[PDB]
Design a protein around this ligand. Structure first.
Ligand SMILES: CC(C)(COP(=O)(O)OP(=O)(O)OC[C@H]1O[C@@H](n2cnc3c(N)ncnc32)[C@H](O)[C@@H]1OP(=O)(O)O)[C@@H](O)C(=O)NCCC(=O)NCCS
Ligand SMILES: O=P(O)(O)O[C@H]1[C@@H](OP(=O)(O)O)[C@@H](OP(=O)(O)O)[C@@H](OP(=O)(O)O)[C@@H](OP(=O)(O)O)[C@@H]1OP(=O)(O)O
Length: 266
């Protein structure tokens, strides 16, 4: 029941809000949530091996993780709204390897505040489903800094989790062998940079944050990240804006527009 008329009006507002600069203090979470079923359906059609599911609670996630394992599926992703009275959409990567099940929750933003608690909450929720040889880990990325782009980041990462399948074997392997987080509750960002490929950081909202990634991956600076033959750095600049003498990235905001426009295309 996609209301194309309404969506078309929305797309124009998004572009307008970028030009007048009001985008920064507007929340797009509610609209992302509403559009997500269509956006997920769109992603799956584009990538049949993606196996993306949209779940609207932690309970629906862990019970879906149980289902997916039961059906013999070995590779899947989940967009999960973890919030109750609010919206917080994260992405989970699911991978069975050898006999053991790997579940990794990726948080696009930081986790310094209540990271440990939330990680333990989600871990325990999954333990209650009682999956044998099931290992869980939560990963901090700290690449989202904008206020309402959790959905876009998670949707984009979901598709990258598929495309970077082989590059993500190691982090899943270390999760299973319990060599990933160890003593620490979740995986901090600096540790994550050593595991994850360049394509995950295309929408990074912070020049300093990118400098931290390339310090862990020297070649990442001058690596082509798209068909427009622009490097990670070159792309970061080509999707930035000036507001009050501060360089900000509207990459994720532009990605929302791309995602919405694709639903309109026949
Ligand atoms: O804490 P700070 O006051 O330093 O926040 C600014 C930093 O977070 C980023 N940031 C914070 N809010 C942001 C927002 N809506 N959009 C884009 N970037 C944001 C900034 O880009 C900056 O990172 P940078 O110095 O590497 O460019
Ligand atoms: O990696 P692909 O699956 O081949 O598709 C990518 C991707 O789009 P998806 O997110 O839908 O997969 C890029 O999006 P992001 O990496 O930014 O998230 C998009 O845009 P970019 O220019 O920013 O990379 C890029 O376009 P292109 O390579 O033409 O520049 C290209 O989309 P296409 O598959 O339609 O080409």
């Amino acid at each position: 029941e996609l209301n194309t008329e309404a969506l078309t009006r929305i797309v124009e507002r998004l572009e307008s809000e970028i030009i007048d600069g009001s985008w920064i203090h507007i929340s797009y979470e509610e609209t992302d949530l509403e559009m997500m079923p269509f956006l997920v359906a769109q992603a799956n059609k584009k990538y049949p091996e993606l196996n993306l599911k949209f779940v609207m609670s932690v309970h629906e996630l862990v019970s879906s993780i149980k289902e997916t394992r039961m059906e013999g599926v070995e590779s899947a992703r989940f967009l999960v709204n973890m919030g109750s009275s609010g919206i917080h959409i994260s992405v989970v990567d699911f991978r069975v390897m050898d006999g053991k099940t790997s579940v990794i929750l990726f948080e696009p933003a930081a986790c310094s505040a209540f990271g440990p608690a939330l990680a333990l909450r989600t871990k325990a929720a999954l333990e209650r489903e009682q999956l044998p040889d099931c290992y869980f880990a939560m990963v901090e990325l700290d690449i989202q800094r904008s206020s309402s782009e959790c959905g876009i980041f998670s949707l984009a990462l979901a598709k990258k989790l598929q495309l970077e399948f082989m590059n993500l074997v190691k982090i899943h392997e270390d999760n299973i062998c319990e060599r990933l987080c160890g003593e620490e509750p979740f995986l901090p960002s600096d540790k994550a940079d050593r595991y994850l490929p360049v394509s995950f950081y295309k929408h990074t909202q912070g020049a300093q944050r990118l400098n931290e990634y390339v310090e862990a991956n020297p070649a990442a600076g001058s690596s082509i990240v798209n068909k427009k033959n622009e490097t990670l750095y070159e792309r970061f600049d080509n999707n930035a804006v000036m507001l009050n003498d501060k360089k900000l990235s509207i990459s994720a905001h532009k990605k929302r527009i791309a995602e919405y426009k694709s639903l309109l295309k026949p």
